[PDB]
């Protein structure tokens, strides 16, 4: 059997929520099935560019700026109102179909559950309320509160200090290889959710546990 | 007016055409290269933030292995090395040589700064016929920190012993402009196809469509 963690931290955008509605809005508006993936990776890259060059900017503001950059790469010239409408879909993402059963199972095993997202606190709450997930969490964390994005070590550590749990008793559950990598190097245990279109980072990014869904992560931990 | 020009190599001086074509053809999509390259860039900053320096080309092969499956392909090691090996043999953009000559004749010091490792960077500049324009060629390997970290630009300034305010970074990437700006440098954006300025305080001192037009603006 697997040692039970005291604390599980979940990524939200890629791990708990289905970004379908936002992916479709972006791909339809820039007229390419490839726009969303490029936009999201550009957003992430500029968040780390901001923090490395000495700056914290609201993640959603970076999202809007990098969507304007991506729209130009795809030949589109969209109004400010149209861009806000497209990005507003990030507030209206359903949960992946397995998540609620998984979170219920984990809560019944008396593991503390928290969310950690780069998205700002107001937005993160609105997302989790819309998806019907907010009530499962003992706490909901945005990196905004510390001004440092994932995968910076201070992002995970702020949760640990707030929850008063040691790193080695905490497991990060994430669908992004870079999220797994950051948590590992901050000393946390890790579970990769192999959502469609996500890979493990092969340069020392191997997680402790791997499963296809959050529910299968719960079943592996609690078996 | 600048004493020193620092040139980005991969996006600014060199045409990545041969590598973009090899990646896109192997993954059967005109969009694979752009996604792969942005993933490479993101994992490089992930490495430096979580406390590790890794050879940039090692990250590039790793992130190509992550990307290929998104396009339904699982390329062999022999296949990957041949695809990525194209990065050693890129032609210069057609305007670059005349611009660099003009700048060199104006007695402005010219240096190259790339995330690519030093062995690769030098082989690239030789293949392209560009090596002799530069007073010095710098890989971020020497400081163990990638662009756009402050230390990358700063190592060049300290080596050349030129102040930030008399140095101009010439780059086709919005993030490279931003890093150079925040390190105190003057900046010139080369608007190569498919690259934009970053709208959150990323505006360069100068903008032009080519390196030759950057040179002409500087020397007019």
TrEMBL record, chain A:
Gene it is expressed from: dhlB
CDD domains from the UniProt entry: HAD_L2-DEX
Pfam families named in the record: Hydrolase
Keyword terms: Hydrolase
NCBIfam families: HAD-SF-IA-v2, HAD_type_II
Lineage of the organism: Bacteria, Pseudomonadati, Bacteroidota, Flavobacteriia, Flavobacteriales
InterPro entries membership: 2-HAD, HAD-like_sf, HAD-SF_hydro_IA, HAD_sf, PGP-like_dom2, S-2-haloacid_dehalogenase
The protein's enzyme class: hydrolase
Keyword Hydrolase: yes
EC code: 3.8.1.2
Protein name: (S)-2-haloacid dehalogenase
Hydrolase recorded as keyword: yes
GO molecular function: (S)-2-haloacid dehalogenase activity
Stated family: Belongs to the HAD-like hydrolase superfamily. S-2-haloalkanoic acid dehalogenase family.
UniProtKB/TrEMBL annotation, chain B:
EC code(s) of this entry: 3.8.1.2
Alphabetic keyword roster: Hydrolase
CDD domains: HAD_L2-DEX (cd02588)
InterPro entries, per database record: 2-HAD, HAD-like_sf, HAD-SF_hydro_IA, HAD_sf, PGP-like_dom2, S-2-haloacid_dehalogenase
One Pfam family, short name: Hydrolase
GO MF entry, a single one: (S)-2-haloacid dehalogenase activity
Gene3D superfamilies from the UniProt entry: HAD superfamily/HAD-like, Putative phosphatase, domain 2
Homology family: Belongs to the HAD-like hydrolase superfamily. S-2-haloalkanoic acid dehalogenase family.
Protein name: (S)-2-haloacid dehalogenase
Originating organism: Zobellia galactanivorans (strain DSM 12802 / CCUG 47099 / CIP 106680 / NCIMB 13871 / Dsij)
């Amino acid at each position: 059997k697997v040692k039970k963690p005291e604390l599980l931290i979940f990524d939200v955008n890629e791990t708990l929520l289905d970004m379908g509605p936002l992916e479709n809005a972006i791909n339809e508006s820039l007229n390419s099935e490839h726009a969303f993936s490029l936009w999201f990776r550009t957003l992430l890259h500029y968040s780390l560019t901001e923090t490395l060059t000495g700056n914290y900017v609201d993640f959603g503001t970076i999202g809007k700026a990098t969507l304007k950059m991506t729209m130009r790469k795809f030949g589109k010239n969209l109004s400010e109102d149209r861009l806000d409408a497209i990005l507003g879909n990030i507030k209206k993402l359903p949960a992946h179909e397995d998540v609620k059963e998984g979170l219920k199972m984990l809560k019944e095993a008396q593991i503390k559950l928290v969310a950690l997202s780069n998205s700002n606190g107001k937005l993160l709450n609105a997302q989790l309320q819309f998806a019907g997930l907010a009530d499962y969490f003992d706490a909901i964390f945005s990196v905004e509160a510390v001004g440092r994005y994932k995968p910076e070590l201070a992002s995970y550590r702020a949760v640990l200090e707030t929850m008063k749990v040691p790193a080695e008793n905490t497991m990060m559950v994430a669908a992004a290889g870079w999220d797994i990598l950051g948590a590992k190097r901050a000393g946390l245990r890790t579970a990769f959710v192999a959502r469609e279109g996500h890979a493990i980072y092969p340069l020392d990014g191997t997680p402790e546990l791997e499963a296809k869904t959050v529910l299968e992560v719960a079943r592996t931990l609690l078996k």
